[PDB]
């Protein structure tokens, strides 16, 4: 039929990076002018595969992966960077054939009042293997000193972005979409 890229991109609530979502894209035809020259993309980099030669190629599947991090935290979605967005939330693998996209969404995902919907795990037990997730908010004890004996020590794993229309770019929401590649999704002009 037709491939649903815009139905990941233009959706009106995204997830957080703690509980990011995936939409399998399968048995369809996928267009890439819409991805080449959309010029709102403040970071758009493709590893191992050329964005201007994605039109002329086949893949077994496309997996869209989408969340909101803050605008400082966007470069953590690279092969082989660390920090909590890479370490504990969305670890890209080193052998990632794909694209990482972001765009500024201060106009749509940041209120004066305080948008606290979008979240990030800053604290985890071990580091995260690639393409894995921890949705659980089981409250994070300091590695062995357990939590729920009577509120002794567990620093809760999730913290959350307070996003504002009146910050600078470090604390501004970026919707970040990753389109990982992997022969039922191919292009036009192909």
């Amino acid at each position, epitope marked *: 039929n037709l491939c649903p890229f815009g139905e990941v991109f233009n959706a009106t609530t995204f997830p957080s990076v703690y509980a990011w979502e995936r939409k399998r894209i399968s048995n369809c035809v996928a267009d890439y002018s819409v991805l080449y020259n959309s010029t709102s993309f403040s970071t758009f*980099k493709c590893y191992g*595969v050329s964005a201007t*030669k994605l039109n002329d190629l086949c893949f077994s599947n496309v997996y869209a992966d989408s969340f909101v991090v803050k605008g400082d935290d966007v470069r953590q979605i690279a*092969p082989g960077q660390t920090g909590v967005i890479a370490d504990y939330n969305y670890k890209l693998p080193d052998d990632f054939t794909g694209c990482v996209l972001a765009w500024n969404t201060r106009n749509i995902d940041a209120t004066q009042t305080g948008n606290y919907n979008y979240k990030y795990r800053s604290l985890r037990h071990g580091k995260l293997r690639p393409f894995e997730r921890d949705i659980s908010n089981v409250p994070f004890s300091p590695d062995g000193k357990p939590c729920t004996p009577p509120a002794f020590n567990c620093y809760w794993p999730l913290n959350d972005y307070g996003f504002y229309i009146t910050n600078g770019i470090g604390y501004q929401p970026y919707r970040v979409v990753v389109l990982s590649f992997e022969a039922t999704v191919c292009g036009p002009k192909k």
Partner: antibody
Amino acid sequence: QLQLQESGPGLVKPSETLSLTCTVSGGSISSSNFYWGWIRQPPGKGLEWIASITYSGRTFYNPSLKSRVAISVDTSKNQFSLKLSSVTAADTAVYYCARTFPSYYDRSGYHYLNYGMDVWGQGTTVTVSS
Amino acid sequence: NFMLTQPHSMSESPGKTVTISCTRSSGSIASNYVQWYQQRPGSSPTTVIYEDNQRPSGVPDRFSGSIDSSSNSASLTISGLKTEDEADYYCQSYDSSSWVFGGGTKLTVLG
């Protein structure tokens, strides 16, 4: 937690061949986005890029060293390795095996590759003396 | 190919900002990306700016990079400079032959 470790001879005798080997720990050497190469620093002077390779086999050298450098990958032992032949006494340096930032094709398909080092190594001191 | 001419030594008292102006000789500056490495003595280098201005994880917030294209130059800028940062600093860029490192800026804080 990718960590780079240099294993080196200490002495290379003058106008012989330096036998260097970098042991890679926390990633695959067969990883196409990453370039892997060496940086030296002769003591009290500044830094200098030598060569870099990936396991495409594609290699960029410093052309003021390209006559004397061969850099090679041994994937079953996870390592990449440096030959520096025809050594002068002013090739005394501390050699840093290093991973690059991952190679991407950008908005307009311009392929940025092998461009700055990322994870550094510990160094091993190569001394040229008779 | 080109050269990258750093100042060899800089000083600035604790707190108030410093700037290391690495000048590229021939070929314009922001054609290629600039990376800055901190080397402390007896130590490995560590990358602190990459792709002209971006910070790795663990690098403090005050470490800002920029490009100064009027004198064809490239700037590492550290506000709030604590006595941690007494270190060498090296710009590095490249063209269609090889990579050119900078000469080292020996930052020291005097108070």
